[PDB]
Design a protein around this nucleic acid. Structure first.
Ligand SMILES: [Mg+2]
Ligand SMILES: [Mg+2]
Ligand SMILES: [Mg+2]
Ligand SMILES: [Mg+2]
Ligand SMILES: [Mg+2]
Ligand SMILES: [Mg+2]
Ligand SMILES: [Mg+2]
Ligand SMILES: [Mg+2]
Ligand SMILES: [Mg+2]
Ligand SMILES: [Mg+2]
Ligand SMILES: [Mg+2]
Ligand SMILES: [Mg+2]
Ligand SMILES: [Mg+2]
Ligand SMILES: [Mg+2]
Ligand SMILES: [Mg+2]
Ligand SMILES: [Mg+2]
Ligand SMILES: [Mg+2]
Lengths: 103, 117, 150, 56, 48, 110, 142
RNA sequence: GUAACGGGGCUAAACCAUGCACCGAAGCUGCGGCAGCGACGCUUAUGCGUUGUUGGGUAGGGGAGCGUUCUGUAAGCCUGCGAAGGUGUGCUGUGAGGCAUGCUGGAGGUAUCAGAAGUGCGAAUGCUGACAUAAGUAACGAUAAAGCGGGUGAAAAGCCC
RNA sequence: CCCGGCGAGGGGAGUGAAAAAGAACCUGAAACCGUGUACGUACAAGCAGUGGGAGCACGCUUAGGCGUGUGACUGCGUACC
């Protein structure tokens, strides 16, 4: 059984027991969170879809780890015009394990 | 006091050179060239951070079109149908569905058709 | 730079860079274009300001209980060992002794020891006071200091 | 008649691929004694086709 | 108590203008002069 | 066992030498020596000598059989340039390098 | 999650016989190009060759609208001084009708190695019968 | 050189009238994160419950930092159970960077908070050194010419006879 | 002691803590020139990068997958002063 959900604007496909990186959701590192933003629950033979968000669908997802990802070197630059910026960034992420898709 | 501008300079060079790894010819050795190359890469990275999203969208849309046409519908019309339905499934997800579980895609197509009619 | 006003090569003709001198700073054995001279760096210490600073530091010392006040502090012979013994008795190491009337023997004793220093009541400086973490002062010395400062 | 850019080490290496010599395929053997020699050139001693012809 | 415990007031010790220290300085390349002027060159400007 | 033989400062460019080295790269020792012998190069003699030395070392110092040995590593490396002044036409001077050569020939029965 | 990308290991290319008898050229050609690309293929990537293999037949029996039979000139250069070469559509049909179709296909596909690969998958015929019977190719109305 | 759609091609895939749509920007919005500037409730060395708003930028103006040598702090502390340096690597910062460890190195380095500066190089036909590049290319200096025998020697077109 | 010209140079043996301290002698960076291993690369055009990424190799983990290297093909993109 796999499910489709939108969280933080961006939508993600997920299966049962899959670890997917999401955005920095300000919740404890060892806590179970529920998702009602589910668009599709796919059983295998009988898929379930309704309106923008499904009526009776809840995703039980365990928070695994908070942290900052890969560092990016934001180089802004202009040729011949004496200018050079360099900013760095690591995007804050929350890794989620999905314990089960509940209907 | 006089400061010998050596060790720090070396360090400065070092990071640039390490950034310039996998660069043909002078780019992975000669500093003048190397720094330039690194800068250009950075520029491109910046651009592509903002450009790559569009490429992926183009890909996903194309995939959807391929799938839609196989099922027997034009892409724009399909999208309109989806909008009418109010289901907020994005391009990426649709593409993924098309790639793997086709029954779901078929169902989606049917729904879109219903919305249209 | 000990050298020449001779141009190493001509202005136009030759293909090389536009040469002026071997003396030029952009060279091997050239000038330090901004060479330093024997310079006085001494800042104008305002007298009143100085006084204030002294007062402040003394107050701080008092607050910290590191300013120890004595009546009788004098070494009999010019003897370092005796001084050391005295220090041990009164529990001190890093110490500035300030005296009103300078005992010579004591001063002599104070010469070699790194942590111990004896100064006259009129001959004291802020950094020295700051430096030594347990400052010891005679009553007469203290009085003299007070007179100086007001 | 002068280069306008510096050519790579790569280019130079490529050029040098032909400039490398051809090794001699194999030595030639005298049948009587067993002397190893160059092709159609005589032995070190002066033997040729199993026969000493030159003393030097 | 120590020399490493005492610190000056903020604003009392200002940074200073180092002219010609790259791009990040901002006060670099030409420092604070501009381009090709008489006022730009060293030993430049005019009398009061 | 891998036994090293070096020659340092051969009055010829390492580049020139490399050609001969390549010819006998990876070959069986006696065969390699033979190849070197009938080679028409001057650098061919130096490398041959080095090989001989290596063989000798293997025989004496280690105690290895000549038959099993192979010419593994043969890195001909660049030597210090002896800078001499050659005058040219119209008062122009060229400091011509007289490049020397390092020749490392290593031999092993494996 | 992560976007799938096509693998030449996983990509299965089927075989299609295309009849060009009494049918309009350009539209057919474009369709062929699309097929070659994989713009119909569900697992399409613009970086991996995904599309199906094509045999096209009756290159001379293709239809053109209006004056195009004599009006349309197909230009190629020799690489020489005055080596600009003129060939009308009819003329092309006369000697080698297979060329025109191929050229069209080339025009309608990417200029790179992938484009070349796609082109390779097109095998052209002036006649009605194909020799590639062992592949079991299915005829599609293009 | 087709060369006056960008090209293939197109009788619509042109051109004009109308509508439903989708794409199409680093635009707006979504989620997250960082700041700069005001309004406010409480306070302070202001943090914020916040709240809004703002955040391309050359010359140029203002503000904030990091690091290098030295100075004190420091006869302090780490350090031959391995310093500086070199070289990797892993981590960590918004950035100059910083911390940790592997190997080499074989003796010094410097916390913290200050102070002082020949302080931070990619460009000056910069200067000095090293090393490429053309390249194993042109060249080897008069077009008065060698050629053989024997000799010594590791080896002889050049040296002796 | 052996090699080689009673050469150079080397290798042993020896000295020392160390010769990865041999007079070209402390450390020994970079360019530059190399060998060996890794993967790619001989129908494919362009600031040689970037983004995407097939595969192939190699480390781990108890599976799972991640790293690292390579990058065929591919979108965009014309150095730096
Ligand atoms: Mg004069
Ligand atoms: Mg000087
Ligand atoms: Mg500015
Ligand atoms: Mg002007
Ligand atoms: Mg100027
Ligand atoms: Mg001006
Ligand atoms: Mg966008
Ligand atoms: Mg700004
Ligand atoms: Mg030092
Ligand atoms: Mg420099
Ligand atoms: Mg500059
Ligand atoms: Mg020659
Ligand atoms: Mg040439
Ligand atoms: Mg020639
Ligand atoms: Mg010649
Ligand atoms: Mg001559
Ligand atoms: Mg003779």
């Amino acid at each position: 059984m796999y499910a489709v959900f939108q969280s933080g604007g961006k939508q993600h496909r997920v299966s049962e027991g899959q670890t997917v990186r999401l955005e920095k959701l300000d919740i404890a590192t060892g806590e179970t969170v529920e998702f009602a933003e589910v668009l599709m629950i796919a059983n295998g033979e009988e898929v379930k879809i309704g309106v923008p968000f499904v009526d009776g669908g809840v995703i039980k997802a365990e928070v695994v780890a908070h942290g900052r990802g890969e560092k990016v070197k934001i180089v802004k630059f202009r040729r011949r015009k004496h200018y050079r910026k360099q900013q760095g960034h690591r995007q804050w992420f929350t890794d989620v394990k999905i314990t089960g898709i509940s209907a | 006091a006089r400061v010998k501008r050596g060790v720090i300079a070396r360090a400065r060079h070092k990071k640039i050179l390490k950034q310039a790894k996998g660069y043909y010819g002078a780019r992975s050795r000669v500093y003048r060239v190397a720094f330039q190359a690194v800068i250009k890469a950075g520029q491109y990275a910046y651009r592509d951070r903002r450009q790559r999203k569009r490429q992926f969208r183009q890909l996903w849309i194309a995939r959807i079109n391929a799938a839609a046409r196989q099922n027997g519908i034009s892409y724009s019309k399909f999208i309109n149908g989806l909008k009418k339905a109010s289901v907020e499934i994005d391009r990426k997800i649709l593409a993924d569905i098309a790639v793997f579980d086709k029954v779901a895609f078929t169902a989606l197509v049917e729904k879109a058709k219903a919305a249209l009619a | 730079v000990t050298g020449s006003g001779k141009k190493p090569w001509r202005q136009k003709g030759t293909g090389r860079a536009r040469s002026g001198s071997i003396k030029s700073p952009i060279w091997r054995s050239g000038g330090v274009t901004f060479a330093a001279r024997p310079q006085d760096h001494s800042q104008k210490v305002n007298k009143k300001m100085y006084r204030g600073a002294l007062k402040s530091i003394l107050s701080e010392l008092v607050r910290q209980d590191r300013l120890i006040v004595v009546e009788k502090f004098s070494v009999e012979a010019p003897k370092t060992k005796l001084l050391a013994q005295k220090l041990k008795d009164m529990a001190l190491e890093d110490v500035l002794i300030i005296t009103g009337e300078l005992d010579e023997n004591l001063f002599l004793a104070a010469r070699n020891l790194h942590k111990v220093d004896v100064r006259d009541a009129t001959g004291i400086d802020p950094v020295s006071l700051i430096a030594f973490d347990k400052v010891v002062m005679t009553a007469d010395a203290v009085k003299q200091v007070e007179e100086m400062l007001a | 008649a002068v280069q306008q850019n510096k050519p790579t080490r790569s280019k130079r290496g490529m050029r040098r691929s032909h400039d490398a010599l051809t090794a001699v395929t194999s030595l030639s053997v005298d049948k009587t004694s067993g002397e190893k020699h160059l092709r159609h050139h005589i032995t070190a001693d002066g033997y040729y086709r199993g026969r000493k012809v030159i003393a030097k | 108590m120590r020399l490493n415990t005492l610190s000056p007031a903020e604003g009392s010790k200002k940074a200073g203008k180092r002219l010609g220290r790259g791009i990040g300085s901002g006060l670099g390349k030409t420092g604070g002069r501009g381009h090709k002027g008489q006022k730009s060159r060293s030993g430049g400007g005019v009398r009061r | 066992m891998e036994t090293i033989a070096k020659h340092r400062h051969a009055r010829s460019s390492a580049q020139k030498v490399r050609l001969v080295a390549d010819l006998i790269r990876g070959k069986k020792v006696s065969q390699a020596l033979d190849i070197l012998t009938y080679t028409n190069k001057k650098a061919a003699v130096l490398v041959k000598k080095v090989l001989e030395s290596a063989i000798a070392n293997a025989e004496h110092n280690d105690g290895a059989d000549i038959d099993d040995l192979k010419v593994t590593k043969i890195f001909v490396d660049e030597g210090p340039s002896m800078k001499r002044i050659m005058p040219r036409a119209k008062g122009r001077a060229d400091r011509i390098l007289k490049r020397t050569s390092h020749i490392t020939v290593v031999v092993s029965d494996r | 999650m992560k976007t799938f990308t096509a693998k030449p290991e996983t990509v299965k290319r089927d075989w299609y016989v295309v009849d060009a008898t009494g049918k309009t050229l350009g539209r057919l050609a474009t369709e062929l190009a699309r097929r070659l690309r994989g713009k119909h293929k569900a697992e399409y990537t613009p970086h991996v060759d995904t599309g199906d293999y094509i045999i096209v037949l009756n290159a001379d029996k293709v239809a053109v609208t209006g004056n195009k039979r004599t009006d349309k000139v197909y230009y190629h250069h020799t690489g020489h001084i005055g080596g600009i070469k003129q060939a009308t559509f009819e003329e092309m049909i006369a000697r080698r009708p297979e060329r025109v179709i191929e050229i069209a296909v080339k025009g309608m596909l990417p200029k790179g190695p992938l484009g070349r690969a796609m082109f390779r998958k097109l095998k052209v015929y002036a006649g009605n019968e194909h020799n590639h019977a062992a592949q079991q190719p299915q005829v599609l109305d293009i």
